[PDB]
């Protein structure tokens, strides 16, 4: 009687975190709603439950690929990592 | 009737920071005393007047070299630098 996939949990700045930009403050979760999930907020840390139509959400990291993509590459900066 | 070089103001821990090392607490103080400086402390800056026999002593660098070479060189790490 319920098809959507089980709740993921990712820290709120995740997403910038893995983007390497700061997002305007509540980015993650408005883009998670924007595409269906239900996200609640406790701490600095987000639940997220996909929607039905959406079983590739497993994931933090599919979940930051939502945020990004919307958002856009381009504000992505382009920084050489510092090789060892 | 006064031989002594110009004082030179040194922050307290610039030694440990050229060094790499973080040198007890005082290290400092105690081997520019030893070396014959008039050292006296305000906050985290030290006033140092080397004596008349040092006139080599002119600068902070000069007093950094005095407490790495007392210390000892083998307490330095090995640390490789990032290199762009
Ligand atoms: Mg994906
Ligand atoms: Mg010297």
Redesign the interface.
Do not use: G
């Given at each position: 009687d319920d098809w959507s996939p089980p709740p993921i949990r990712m820290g709120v700045d995740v997403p910038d975190r893995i983007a390497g930009v700061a997002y305007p403050q509540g980015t993650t979760a408005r883009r998670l709603a924007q595409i269906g999930a239900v996200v609640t907020h406790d701490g600095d840390t987000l639940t997220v439950t996909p929607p039905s139509w959406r079983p590739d959400l497993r994931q933090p990291a599919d979940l930051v690929e939502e945020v990004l993509r919307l958002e856009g590459l381009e504000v992505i900066p382009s920084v050489?990592p510092?090789?060892?």
């Open positions: 050489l510092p090789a060892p």
